[PDB]
Design a protein around this ligand. Structure first.
Ligand SMILES: OC[C@H]1O[C@@](CO)(O[C@H]2O[C@H](CO)[C@@H](O)[C@H](O)[C@H]2O)[C@@H](O)[C@@H]1O
Ligand SMILES: OC[C@H]1O[C@@](CO)(O[C@H]2O[C@H](CO)[C@@H](O)[C@H](O)[C@H]2O)[C@@H](O)[C@@H]1O
Ligand SMILES: OC[C@H]1O[C@@](CO)(O[C@H]2O[C@H](CO)[C@@H](O)[C@H](O)[C@H]2O)[C@@H](O)[C@@H]1O
Ligand code: NA
Ligand code: NA
Ligand code: NA
Ligand code: NA
Ligand code: NA
Lengths: 987, 987
């Protein structure tokens, strides 16, 4: 037997959990001495175990090939190898427990000083190593770690020396554990969380288990704080000053009155549990969780989960998320009305839990387990059902539960994610129910729900959710399991996939959540895009995604699928989501006399809010103020009268003058997560502008050799298109039916016998390559010697027989231009046996000058499509051209403003104004073909023109990248259509 | 009505044939004065009719915007616009008779002098204008042309002036006629054939119709030469000096003895038909065509068509094919045993016909008609069935037939190609049968064969051809039409699609052609690749194809699908085809005493051939000479004894010494198409070398820290791979299962429920991204203290569970290395529900040095795959590395030499030798991933290494790009396998 490295590889292929570690326990704030070893370490990378040197480097002397590296780190974020993104696919051959030969081996070393306070007893703590670590101290092997997002501690008593010590950690990227860590995210090896030296004084406390229930009938707290040392219960004193409590650890007491903890009102009581040699500081939130009548209840009430799935990602540091970024993003979530977080799909940094307790989120704390890439072989060799993996998988769940069991914010334990069904998941569930019966068990991966307490699905359609909400979904084959599941409350652990332009269809889910008590709510997939900052040639910065780092196998931009970008800048989807889940409903009376107010919170009344009104018109604000609202109880409603001035202003409005009344609920005072005046909810009533009246056609057509003139518009006699409007140069005018595919349009819709993505259906149909034939140009009798001009055209694509006849009828009184567009199908829009859907029915104006400013009356400020835009409110908006765009990582259709009544483009010295019945407005400095061709933002280039899109109809954007496509009501099937616009140019 | 250009466009949209032209007639060699106007014209291009100037340019004075252009020309070959390639797709919206707005308009003008010999009467002749011409002479409109590959003539009497004249031609690229000219080829507008001024003397001859039949019972010729003027029969004298004939035009006579015309023996008699004012020169071939007993017969005998489809293309001049290129390519065809040409899919240049008469080809003369792009709408609006198109389509057939009706080589008229079924095709057939009953009618497009005389298909499988050959194919629904068709002979007008590496499966068709009299044979698709020469940055030259010229819609490299490249360099497919269709069969006796000889010709005996033998061995030729063969009649056979020296040499051969006896039939004398010694047919008998005997394993394994040594091979202990063999650096060794997809592998195979191209099946299966895990390395007891070395590995791909266990067992005596490779499936090779096929079972050696020379014993010199290589003969070959490659336009797998027994690579100072039971050999200076990624030849780059492929098994290459995929016997399904090689290095 002559091959090198067999012992190292045999360890990496082990099914066992780590070796040599102390018992799993809680992460506890203690007064015991501690020393963080975070900082600059020395690092050496080898390409595999068989060539990783056995050169005594653990002793730290004469190190050849080492360089400095910050720890904690994801080491491919610092030039060592490269990030690699796969979704489901494993990046190595599926032969568990075997590892590939190409397996980055990172040797880590740091020298540190240990003072006398770490003797006789201390330990070393590692809060995360991806995926397999071997640890030596002063050349002595302490043990190994498995479970990349889990904590390990090693006793160093009698190995640590007073004074200088050398810590050495060999980290393998891949191991047998990789087979159970197949989350959809970047593969990033490293020592990516804290390394800590902790003294273990005699007569100390190793573990604590807080039990703090709430009796919602009596208002009492039920408190018991367990404390142990070496796995044995110990004498300790628990003190809770604010509740006047001094009690023994280990005894259950009834606190006469406590204020209960919820995400809405995250009341925490400071406490300490003390033994002779060590004191632990705790924050106690009293709350009880119960499943009753097919509802998930906290403190006696059904709650609504307004959730997101939170991965840990940083665009420059990988899995290392700085604390200030964590604090800021949780405040951002609260500021967008989120009340719940799922830790997809592993425990977070241990510091996250106290922030969730404090700011207030319902947390689904999920174990580090995912075997998704076994699905493609029918789950053959799945670790979840393989007896050899039982100890490893129970260990993951044990470490998960033990670390975070004291936190009020944790309201469910999750076994893992997309790991199939199997006996080891049952073992993990049984262990958890025995250890901590206070929290229900979640696991979507087994739809029978045999070993869980809630029925969880991901991306179930709105239709299926409505059936589940009514308790009428199809039965399981097993009657006993069906009865159990039908009595469970239902949660969407992932829904309304937020990739690219979208997500559409959020309102339809939310209406069901509000209607059906069995529905717990849902967690958007996902909070953040995992973009990785990259540099172009001129040092331009942009986000990269799958395949941008040389991966042989990858899943492209599927890692950029979030409500916020990697730097936590909101995508439009977050602005819409904030509105969808707003915790108050404000319905403003049509006559502006008042508003109906429903408090949708579960526990809090409306006393935290100030209720403000404003009336706005073309010239700005006309009236505004605040109104007193007696506190509305949770789940109750009332009618609030507005001051008489408001309705009087509505009564005096001249007909056709637009005006908007907005009623807003804002924070009356600073909270922990935002300042006074922060907006939480709103409602509006709009007095719409009258339809624009088309101008009298009193100008005639002036005919020249090659041009025609009709008031302010010049036409080409060869094309029939305008070449200038009031001096503004027009390079092209034509019909649009297509847009640059969104991420959703690139996904298959599994619903019918056509599984081509919409984008492919469009390409096959030629919708991206329309051409127009001129049929004729004629002038017609207008008014008082005036003439209208009708240009007849037909739009089709090469090699297709279907088309649309498009007639433009132009009229002018000399200042205002009337444009009537009529579209008529000529032949059936069917291609490859399937009917062709359209993205829109609209016009593209290509103008020969650049636009500096875009203003409009309609919905804003951000984009809106038929099935999105909930956060776009009625008003007057004005933006520089650049701010009309949306910086999605892969450029795609975006930036449309649906519901526009008027628009004004400032092209240098002129202003082009458009009016009509509702239209969507888009303005870009590059063409649709440039947008579609661009894979990253630097691929976009301005060409000196303005591309102006005026759409009479748009389709929805849906969530077809993962989950439901566009709902039926928002699909755009070929039809005949006609629409009127007016245009005019101002200097 | 204000749009510009409506009259021009109305003409372009006309359904009528041209206007103003003289009656269609034959192309005739006359003594009437003539003046070619070919030469430098003046040319102006406009982008469409509506902007094409009406500026009096036809008068030729004050021309603004004109530049010189050669005529004839395809004008996009000279910088004016660009070539555009589509296969089926129309490049404009399918709204016949309407034309797109983007429609290149080329104005052509030339000034010329007309002497007195062109008065009083002359005409102007245009032999081709694509697609619509309007002609003016001295400002007077003569008429228009429709039918791009058809001739038009215009009477200029009284318009032509003595002295200077100005000819003006406006040419539209697209017209209504484009709908009926949808051939799979480049769209190339232009005046692309001759322009001629011809005097029409009084008492002349306008048309001639030669009837020259052959009575094969009596040997008589049946001759009647019709002559007419102004459409009326005239008095003229026919003289045929060689047959001692002087007869009146219009009278049928019986010539007592004539020598008949065939492609094999193209006897032509010179003749002249003379009136008082004009004499026409003719070449008369006597031959009669008959369909009898479901056979296509010429001169009383069934013939075998050994055919190609000939387009007219030139890589720098487009549709203009210089005469010297025509002459050379027809000689090249004869030199590759071709005897038949289909003029796909329009009449050729008129000069082609006399060359075919002279050199000898059976010609299928096809009308300019193809409506293929209507198929995708179920043939809705197909012109072939639209009454408005009757006159246009009958006109095309009339001009087709009238031009070429005097040529003996034309043995069938074809109505067109892929034009569906319809009443206008029936009209064309009826017109043709009435006008010229002497030639059968061909048209594949209507499978019922209602209006034809032969049953024609394209790309029918070998299986279906065998059924048709036996007369047992499934019946038509209509019993009367079925009876008619079952009594027709059967031709493949297109088969064994020759795109890229291939075509495979030619032998299986040919065996059927020889077995079944109903089978007429077939015409390969196609003779030439339509590559267009393009230049890179350093002025490197390469061929471009579809999409390389900016086309919005195109069909890529489907235009490069020929037996020869655009410069008429043979592809390997032509070398194989020559052998498949060789007209003699030579079967050499195993004992080398003689050979069996079958004469497969239809008319000629074997007297044109010299029969040569040669015996070759490792040291070169050992014996050779000629042998006398009494002439063998067509379709007969004989046994020919070889001189005794040959068998004596075979008897004396020491066992295991390779030697090859080749018997060849060459031209005994110069022919019109090749020189004496040109090889026509051959056969071989090979005395195979014994299996190489593996060396005694008497060397032990020498173990060092990181390396192992076993005689001349050094191994890495980390990988188990050799790092040098006898000093030759080895960078990598591993198993191969994949190759860079051929054009055929990129085509769908419609046969089963998996319609993914093989290339896609491979990509989905990960076959292009294999990885290898090392399982162990061990030494084992050899002989006399010697050791063998077994390296155990497993090959798989990321995210897959299937693999193959590959064990390498190495042995050496110190000079020769034995390598045994054993492959064993581990798990089922199924992916996405379908079994994964392999391209090969082989080894890739990546050597760290360049190869200058590759030599081998096996088959050669050119490439061979399991279902190709018929033209590769047994022998010893040696080539510089560059000449191992094949210059396909899109690089792809190619260059394998199947059937190799030994190989020698010269890498500088060393020679690496490989021996084994048969293996395929490939050697390249770049990797497979470079080959697969390259879209054009300049994308290939040498990297300083040698990539050496030794394959124990290969799959076939088939013709899946269009037609049958790999036949079952040549498919390579996953299996277990083992194979032995020996290696040794010489300095
Ligand atoms: O295919 C549905 C079926 O598969 C199971 C495991 O057998 O769940 C797996 O597949 C689901 C569908 O892709 C995933 O949603 C789930 O996460 C995964 O574990 C069954 O539970 C389910 O009935
Ligand atoms: O970082 C969270 C932090 O944001 C602050 C200050 O920026 O909150 C204010 O700022 C937000 C920026 O959009 C406002 O949207 C928000 O309404 C406002 O309170 C801090 O107060 C908060 O703690
Ligand atoms: O161009 C046709 C022309 O080729 C010639 C001379 O090249 O024929 C000879 O050349 C061929 C080149 O490969 C040989 O393969 C062929 O065997 C040989 O006769 C002319 O004779 C022929 O007319
Ligand atoms: Na609910
Ligand atoms: Na994702
Ligand atoms: Na108040
Ligand atoms: Na035959
Ligand atoms: Na082709």
């Amino acid at each position: 037997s002559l091959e090198l490295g067999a012992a190292d590889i045999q360890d990496l292929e082990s099914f066992e959990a780590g070796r040599g570690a102390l018992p799993a326990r809680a992460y506890l704030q203690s007064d015991a001495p501690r020393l963080s070893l975070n900082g600059e370490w020395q690092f050496r990378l080898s390409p595999g175990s068989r060539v990783a040197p056995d050169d005594g480097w653990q002793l730290g002397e004469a190190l050849n090939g080492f360089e400095s590296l910050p720890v904690p780190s994801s080491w491919p974020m610092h030039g060592h190898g490269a990030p690699a993104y796969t979704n489901v696919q494993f990046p190595f051959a599926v032969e568990p427990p075997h590892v590939p030969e190409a397996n980055p081996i990172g040797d880590h070393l740091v020298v540190f000083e240990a003072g006398p306070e770490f003797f006789p007893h201390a330990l070393l703590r590692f809060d995360g190593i991806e995926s397999a670590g071997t640890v030596w101290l002063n050349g002595v092997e302490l043990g190994t770690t498995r479970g990349s997002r889990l904590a390990h501690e090693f006793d160093v008593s009698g190995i640590l020396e007073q004074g200088e010590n050398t810590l050495a950690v060999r980290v393998a990227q891949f191991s047998a554990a990789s087979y159970v860590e197949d989350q959809d995210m970047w593969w990033l090896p490293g020592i990516f969380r804290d390394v800590t030296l902790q003294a273990r004084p005699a007569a100390g406390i190793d573990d604590v288990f807080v039990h703090a229930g709430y009796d919602h009938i009596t208002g009492e707290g039920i408190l018991k704080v367990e404390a142990s040392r070496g796995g044995q219960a110990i004498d300790a004193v628990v003190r809770v000053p604010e509740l006047a409590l001094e009690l023994a650890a280990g005894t259950e007491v009834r606190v006469p009155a406590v204020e209960p903890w919820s995400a809405e009102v995250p009341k925490l009581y400071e406490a300490a549990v003390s033994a002779a040699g060590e004191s632990v500081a705790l924050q106690i939130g009293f709350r009880s969780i119960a499943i009753e009548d097919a509802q998930f209840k906290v403190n006696g009430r059904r709650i609504l989960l307004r959730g997101v799935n939170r991965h840990e990602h940083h665009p420059r540091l990988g899995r290392v998320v700085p604390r200030d970024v964590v604090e800021a993003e949780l405040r951002l979530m609260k500021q967008h009305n989120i009340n719940a977080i799922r830790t997809s799909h592993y425990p977070p940094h241990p510091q996250f839990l106290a922030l969730a307790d404090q700011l207030g989120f319902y947390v689904v704390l999920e174990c580090d387990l995912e075997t998704h890439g076994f699905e493609s072989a029918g789950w053959a060799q799945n670790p979840s059902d393989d007896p050899q993996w039982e100890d490893a998988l129970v260990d993951r769940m044990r470490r998960t539960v033990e670390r975070d069991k004291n936190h009020a914010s944790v309201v469910m334990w999750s076994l893992g994610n997309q790991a199939g069904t199997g006996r080891n998941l049952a073992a993990m569930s049984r262990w958890t129910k025995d250890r901590d019966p206070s929290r229900p068990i979640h696991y979507e991966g087994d739809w029978s729900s045999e070993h869980v307490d809630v029925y969880s699905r991901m991306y179930a359609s709105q239709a299926e959710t409505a059936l589940i909400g009514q308790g009428i979904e199809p039965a399981l084959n097993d009657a006993a399991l069906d009865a159990r599941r039908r009595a469970m409350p239902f949660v969407l652990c992932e829904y309304v996939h937020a990739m690219g332009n979208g997500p559409g269809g959020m309102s339809e889910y939310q209406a069901l959540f509000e209607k059906y008590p069995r529905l717990m709510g849902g967690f958007v997939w996902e909070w953040l895009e995992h973009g990785i900052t990259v540099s172009t040639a001129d040092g331009v910065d942009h986000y990269g995604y799958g395949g941008d780092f040389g991966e042989e196998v990858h899943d492209g931009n599927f890692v950029t699928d979030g409500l916020v970008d990697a730097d936590r800048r909101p995508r439009p989807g977050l602005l819409d989501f904030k509105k969808v889940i707003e915790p108050l409903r404000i319905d403003v009376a049509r006559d502006w006399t008042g508003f109906t107010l429903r408090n949708g919170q579960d526990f809090a009344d409306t006393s935290a809010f100030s209720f403000r009104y404003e009336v706005e018109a073309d010239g700005g604000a006309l009236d505004g103020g605040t109104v007193d609202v007696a506190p509305v109880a949770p789940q109750s409603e009332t009618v609030v009268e507005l001051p008489g001035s408001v309705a009087a202003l509505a009564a005096g409005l001249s007909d056709g003058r637009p005006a908007v009344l907005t009623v807003r609920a804002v924070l009356g005072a600073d909270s922990a997560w935002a300042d006074a005046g922060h907006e939480v909810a709103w409602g509006q009533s709009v007095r719409e502008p009258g339809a624009p009246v088309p101008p009298a056609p009193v100008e005639p057509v002036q005919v020249q050799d090659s041009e025609l003139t009709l008031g302010p518009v010049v036409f080409s006699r060869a094309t029939g298109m305008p070449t200038s409007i009031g001096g503004v140069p027009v390079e092209k005018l034509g019909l649009t039916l297509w847009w640059a595919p969104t991420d959703n349009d690139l996904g298959r819709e599994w619903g019918g016998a056509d599984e081509r993505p919409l984008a492919t259906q469009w390409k096959d149909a030629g919708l991206n390559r329309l051409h127009t034939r001129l049929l004729g140009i004629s002038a017609n009798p207008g008014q008082d010697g005036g003439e209208t001009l009708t240009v007849r055209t037909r739009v089709s694509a090469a090699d297709k027989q279907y088309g649309v006849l498009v007639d433009y009828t132009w009229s002018t009184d000399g200042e205002t231009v009337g444009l009537r567009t009529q579209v008529r199908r000529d032949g059936t829009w069917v291609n490859r046996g399937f009917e062709v859907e359209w993205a829109r029915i609209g016009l593209e104006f290509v103008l020969g000058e650049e636009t500096e400013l875009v203003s409009w009356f309609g919905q804003g400020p951000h984009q809106s499509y038929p099935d999105t835009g909930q956060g776009a409110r009625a008003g007057w908006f004005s933006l520089p051209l650049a701010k009309m765009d949306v910086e999605y990582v892969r450029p795609q259709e975006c930036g449309a403003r649906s519901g526009s009544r008027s628009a004004a483009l400032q092209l240098g010295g002129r202003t082009l104004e458009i009016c009509g019945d509702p239209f969507a407005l888009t303005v870009r400095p590059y063409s649709q073909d440039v947008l579609d061709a661009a894979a990253h933002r630097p691929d976009l280039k301005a060409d000196g023109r303005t591309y102006l899109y005026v759409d009479h109809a748009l389709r929805g954007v849906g969530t077809a990248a993962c989950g439901p496509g566009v709902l039926e009501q928002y699909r755009l099937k070929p039809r005949d259509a006609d629409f009127i616009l007016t245009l005019k140019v101002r200097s």
